């Protein structure tokens, strides 16, 4: 019984991990812009 | 360096001075030896975790395990000293003076 359920749980983890992989490109694009915007903003106050 | 490193190194120095400045009890000196291990464990763990050195994450565990085995040997010597003299005073361990 534990073997059958654990195999199913491994399949459920793969499905959950693949949803993350589908979203990682969008999240990475967002993260890049947020980081660059933050650095740019610090550069204006540094100039002042 | 980072501010935390100031105090971790200070803790190691404090325990090293405690270790090198004996009083009477051997157990008090063995505690200082463990103090140095604990500060080494923290300093190593901080460095390894902050740098994201992934495979080095096991190193503090190995340090802990081996130094605890060292401490077990140290305690066993202390009880044998205590069985001989009835205390763990270092002043009793002066036969090899001559």
């Amino acid at each position: 019984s534990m073997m059958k359920w654990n195999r199913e749980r491994r399949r459920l983890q793969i499905e959950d991990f693949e949803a993350r992989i589908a979203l990682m490109p969008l999240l990475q694009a967002e993260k890049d812009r947020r980081v660059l915007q933050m650095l740019r903003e610090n550069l204006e106050e540094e100039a002042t | 360096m980072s501010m935390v490193y100031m105090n971790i190194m200070m803790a190691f120095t404090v325990s090293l001075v405690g270790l090198l400045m004996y009083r009477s009890h051997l157990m008090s000196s063995l505690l200082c030896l463990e103090g140095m291990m604990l500060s080494l464990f923290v300093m190593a763990a901080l460095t390894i975790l902050n740098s994201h050195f992934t495979l080095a994450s096991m190193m503090p565990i190995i340090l802990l395990v081996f130094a605890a085995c060292e401490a077990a040997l140290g305690l066993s010597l202390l009880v044998m000293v205590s069985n001989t003299y009835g205390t763990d005073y270092v002043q009793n361990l002066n036969l090899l003076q001559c």
Binding site: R11, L12, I14, E15, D16, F17, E18, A19, R20, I21, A22, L23, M24, P25, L26, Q28, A29, E30, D32, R33, V35, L36, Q37, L39, R40, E41, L43 | -
Partner: protein
């Protein structure tokens, strides 16, 4: 040292996909299949360039595809999708396996109204190939020229001239 070159605040502006994580999770499997091509192009750019400044335009296309993808769901399957991601959102772990009834309704709606086929288990974790016009970076690390190696000793090994030559020893 030089000045860290940064793009302008306006060079970073773009329409943002302002939906919650449960909404993205509910659409993740269809989104992976539908927007794969611009997504993989962006991720290829990021891993080759190792510089977020060099893939901003590719990142804007990732956003555009995501918006158009969610505009198609909104036009056609707004109600089955809303019921589905609302079921995901209740769970503290956002579990797929607690929402199979609602997933089936959403899945059946996109297939009929858009022809969207949910990718199979294992598909979205495949390594795929991307055709890009972008040139391949040549020195992505900005490495300097490596030091020249030490001159290499070579020839035929001969006996030491007159032996060890150690003080008086003749061998």
């Amino acid at each position: 040292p030089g000045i860290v070159e940064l793009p302008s605040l306006e060079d970073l502006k773009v329409q943002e996909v302002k939906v919650s994580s449960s909404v993205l999770k509910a659409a993740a499997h269809h989104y992976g299949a539908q927007c794969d091509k611009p997504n993989k192009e962006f991720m290829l750019c990021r891993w080759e360039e190792k510089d977020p400044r060099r893939c901003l335009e590719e990142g804007k296309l990732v956003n555009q595809c995501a918006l158009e993808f969610f505009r198609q769901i909104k036009r056609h399957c707004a109600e089955p999708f809303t019921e589905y991601w609302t079921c995901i959102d209740y769970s503290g772990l956002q579990l797929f396996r607690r929402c199979r009834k609602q997933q089936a309704q959403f899945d059946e709606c996109v297939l009929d109204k858009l022809g969207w086929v949910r990718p199979d288990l294992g598909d979205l974790s495949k390594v795929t190939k991307v055709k890009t016009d972008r040139p391949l970076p040549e020195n992505p690390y900005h490495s300097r020229a490596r030091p020249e190696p030490n001159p290499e000793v070579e020839g035929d090994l001969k006996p030491a001239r007159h032996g060890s030559r150690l003080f008086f020893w003749t061998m």
